Amino acid sequence: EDKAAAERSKEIDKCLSREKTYVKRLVKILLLGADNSGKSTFLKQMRIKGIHEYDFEIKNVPFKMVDVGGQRSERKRWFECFDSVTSILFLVDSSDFNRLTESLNDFETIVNNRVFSNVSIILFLNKTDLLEEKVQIVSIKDYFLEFEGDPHCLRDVQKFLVECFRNKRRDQQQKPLYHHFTTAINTENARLIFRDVKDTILHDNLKQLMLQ
Amino acid sequence: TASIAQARKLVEQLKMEANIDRIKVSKAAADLMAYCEAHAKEDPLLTPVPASENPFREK
Amino acid sequence: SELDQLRQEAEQLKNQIRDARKACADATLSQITNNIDPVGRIQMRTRRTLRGHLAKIYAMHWGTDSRLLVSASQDGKLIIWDSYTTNKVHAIPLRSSWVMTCAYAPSGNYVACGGLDNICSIYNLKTREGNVRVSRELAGHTGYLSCCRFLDDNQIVTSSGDTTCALWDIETGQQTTTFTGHTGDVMSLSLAPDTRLFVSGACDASAKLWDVREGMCRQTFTGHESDINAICFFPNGNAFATGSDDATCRLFDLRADQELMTYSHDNIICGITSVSFSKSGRLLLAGYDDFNCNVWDALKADRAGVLAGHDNRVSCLGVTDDGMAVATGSWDSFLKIWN
Amino acid sequence: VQLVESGGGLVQPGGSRKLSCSASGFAFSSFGMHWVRQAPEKGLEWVAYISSGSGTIYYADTVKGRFTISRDDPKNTLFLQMTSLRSEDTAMYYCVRSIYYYGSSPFDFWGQGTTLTVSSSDIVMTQATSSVPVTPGESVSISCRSSKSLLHSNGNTYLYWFLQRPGQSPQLLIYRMSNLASGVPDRFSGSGSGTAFTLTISRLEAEDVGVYYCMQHLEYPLTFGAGTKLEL
Amino acid sequence: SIAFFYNRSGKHLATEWNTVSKLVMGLGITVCIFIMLANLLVMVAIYVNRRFHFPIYYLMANLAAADFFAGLAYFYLMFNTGPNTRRLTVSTWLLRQGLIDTSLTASVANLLAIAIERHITVFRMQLHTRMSNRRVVVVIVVIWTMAIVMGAIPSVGWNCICDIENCSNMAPLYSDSYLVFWAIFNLVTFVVMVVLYAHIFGYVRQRTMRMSRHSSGPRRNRDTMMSLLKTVVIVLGAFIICWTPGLVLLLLDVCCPQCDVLAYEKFFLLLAEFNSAMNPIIYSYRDKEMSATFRQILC
Ligand SMILES: CCCCCCCC/C=C\CCCCCCCC(=O)OC[C@@H](O)COP(=O)(O)O
């Protein structure tokens, strides 16, 4: 009977509607980096052929890290299926002074895309302890120019590295850019991302409510 | 030296694509037109179908 | 050296190919079609609306029975629809939510899908256990899968973003033939009605006609500007139509080696996401990023209708094998049947 | 792939007996199940029905009130409860799985059957073919008829054909009067327009002996035609 | 006859059009045209723009319905006032006044409903675009149901037509226990929505200060905390300006018998109906898309 087939359709709708609540509170984060950045160790501290999505939960909020590998070099509009993500996480090696110039270009191409507008950025300067040892014995003036600070002060070099990243955006006044000098701390890395995506949503609500 | 083989195959493929049979564009244009006119009555979208035979309106 | 000679040889081959086309380019399709009756204003109405998808709809395909239909979405689910009664026959959950294509087997026992996971998965629809289970995963591509079209119950053709197309044997599970020759990523694919040749569009403004039995490229067509993201085959099987990001569509012929008609207007600046033909080949439907769908007089290039009613960019578009309906999906997670 | 029913036995009039059926080998949560009884020497008779998810329940007019049918999906089992057992309930009870979507084949798999002994409108579906002698290698036709037209507005004719081999559970041959069930040889064919139906066998064999039944699915008080024995 | 109550209430019955009567009618009518037109524009813009189909805008389109009604309820009263109030019967008098209360109650209750929607989608970690339309429609029907109840109780017994001794002077047919009950309803509403808006400001202010080291990108800073204090002041300041004199007269009529509250009553009510005209320019002016939508509607 065609009336018993209609009950099967309505039983499917009940299963579909049980997932609508989950997807209405889902936060997607796109993870980018390199081989030396430390993407393998960073995910090892997270208690969870293409993209490796890592679904998990923090403070009863669903999360999902869309961790592309080397495929992120693709430069077509089709590859930008991530226009619905809420934030972008970027891992950078602070110790490797030679590849900092290389790591400063791929950042420029991604954050200036016309698709990733209305998307916030998070920066994780990995291996800060190695930077502390690398500085005070090796100068950064031999690797970079236009550095007016002292090459033997951690706070002077750190205040310069972040500014190099922040100056490669031609669409600054639409969304913020957060930066953290993280390490293999293994504990605060999940909580630091939580605050950055909490205030990203808060500053989307304030304009949507006409409250600002 | 390095791209010599790739360009050697490129001209070989170009050689095959160049030496093929071709017809006049006027002959080709008539063939497409003759197909559309012959199957005009069998198009329920160009010529709308009465609501009795419509499977999406008869309910 | 020899590379300079090969470059010189390639320079003069293209001149003789253009001259061969130019000599045969005696007239145009527009001049011959200057005396045929116009089709008038096509008016279509939303008969049914298929609700239930939770995210953007990326792909949709029609069954050969002209009643069943499959669709895919960013949510990561596959739904089989009964277009007559808006009844969900099946609901297949996928492993990866980044699925950009889907296909229906001509017999009806299988469906296929793929995406940014670089593999194509085949699902058995007629099982004795009463469920839907994956039959085989087809690995062997180095880029994301962008299109797939069933050849037989045991053969499928897949195109990928690694600048190649392949032919598989589902029983064995190994790549039988690999089609090389493109430069950019292949975005589209279209099986011939006879199922012995097919065409593919890539992000280099080039379309190539292949041969499944021989595995070699027969013909090449140029004339677009941006990436070609939509290709379809004329019902006669002797021509095909393209659609690119430069807001233009063109009609190429496999025998004349030439573009015949150009489908563009000054009020359209957005690209074409989908292209489909009518049962008689007199209409040409194309989706756009301007949230609408446009109907073109294929023999006259004159616009003849608008399929408006979607709240976002139109992604998918298909016509049934009997020509009685048109289904369109879009980024607002709805499908609509137009008659 | 397996449908085992048990719980029957000798009972007294007025007593209560509970029938349990256990499924193993398929997605039991998406199948609507049935109870079909058969007198010790007469034909089959539909009894009850429970949908998938226990949405709708139907009963026979002879057992309504006294019988209750329930299912336990997580445990993969189906139950039948009888309270006031009379002397007309002596029969053999089968369990039949059935799934309903566009293009499905219901009533495809039948159980094994449990016996029960008690020591004490609707479409009338006919079959005037009580006995027929045949010879292997020939062609035969089995005729049938119904009171009402089984052809529906949506083009579907709801007539089914079943085969009960000696000492075997019934098996499905033709569903919806024209479609051949999976696993059945091509020699079986069906015909008819809206009232008179015929099942045709091209070449006979040694395993075609048994009783051929038939059924309607147009209105849920399902009725079976009388048996047709292939004497051979 | 209402002439029995009016003489006992110290009121007067006009027989000819006066200078005050002409000025009040003329000045109040031109206000009514703006209310029924500006609030009608907000209705169309929300419906014709697909970018306004979110829960916050449905409480703003509902506020236009409450304010558009408040224009009709003033259009009716203006005609039946002056040389026309010596003609209404008791049954028509209670209908004329009952339409005023059903409109002003719906307007005040919609101001509180907006203040709770903002407070909900600010302390919750979910996007307002990804919210369901179930809570708004539940609130919308409750707003309209309570307003009709508050406009029907004085006609079913809560009036002084049976207790002729103690009832107000401004409304001779209304008991003095119903003017006090209405003043409490709105005074409590204002106090609640002041607290709701002062908790939003204090919460976002403590988060902008915390995310100042890490977040040097163009968000937060002082343009955040000065475009949010301005909005709170305007929504709260307008309520005080257009509603504080009205409530003082209501509690002065009941409490002070030796008060000439009959002189200011005809202008303190017009000023209270001007709030229904300032509302569409307070909740529908920050949206640059809404302003752009207005121009595309008016030619
Ligand atoms: C001055 C009032 C400030 C705000 C009014 C509050 C809204 C209604 C709430 C509760 C009931 C109060 C009823 C009396 C308030 C004054 C309304 C009124 O009726 O004023 C008289 C005015 O029609 C003209 O009087 P007539 O010329 O005799 O009709």
Written account of the structure:
The complex is a heteropentamer of chains A (212), B (59), C (339), D (232) and E (299). Chain A is an alpha/beta fold. Chain A is built from six helices and six strands. Chain A has a single domain (26-207), classed as Rossmann fold. Helix content of chain A is 39%, strand content 18%. Chain A has a six-stranded mixed β-sheet, sandwiched between helices. The longest helix of chain A is centred in the first third of the chain and has 22 residues, at 2-23. Chain A is elongated and about 80 Å long. With 59 residues, chain B is mainly alpha-helical. Helices cover 49% and strands 0% of the residues of chain B. The radius of gyration of chain B is 24 Å and the shape is elongated. Chain B starts with a helix and ends in a 21-residue tail after the last helix. Chain C has helices at residues 3-24, 29-32, and strands at residues 46-50, 57-62, 68-73, 77-82, 87-93, 99-104, 110-115, 120-124, 133-138, 145-152, 155-160, 164-169, 174-179, 190-191, 197-202, 206-211, 219-222, 228-233, 239-244, 249-253, 259-263, 272-277, 283-288, 293-297, 303-306, 314-319, 326-330, 335-338. The radius of gyration of chain C is 20 Å and the shape is globular. A four-stranded antiparallel β-sheet of chain C has the order 1-28-27-26, with no helix packed on it. Chain C has a single domain (2-338), classed as Methylamine Dehydrogenase, Chain H (7 Propeller). In chain C, β10 (145-152) and β11 form a beta hairpin. Chain D is mainly beta. Chain D is built from no helices and 21 strands. Chain D has strands at 3-6, 10-11, 17-23, 32-38, 44-50, 57-59, 67-72, 77-82, 91-98, 109-110, 114-118, 125-126, 131-132, 140-146, 159-164, 171-175, 179-180, 188-192, 196-201, 210-216, 229-230. In chain D, the strands form four sheets. In chain D, strands 2, 4, 5, 6, 9, 10 and 11 form a seven-stranded mixed β-sheet that branches. In chain D, a hairpin with a 3-residue loop joins β18 (188-192) and β19 (196-201). The interface between B and C is large, with 41 and 62 residues. The complex binds (2R)-2-hydroxy-3-(phosphonooxy)propyl (9E)-octadec-9-enoate. (2R)-2-hydroxy-3-(phosphonooxy)propyl (9E)-octadec-9-enoate binds at residues 77, 81, 85, 97, 100-101, 104, 170-171, 174, 179, 182, 246, 249-250, 265-266, 268-269, 272 of chain E. Chain C: It comes from Homo sapiens (Human). Chain C: Keywords: Acetylation, Disease variant, Host-virus interaction, Intellectual disability, Phosphoprotein, Repeat, Transducer, WD repeat.
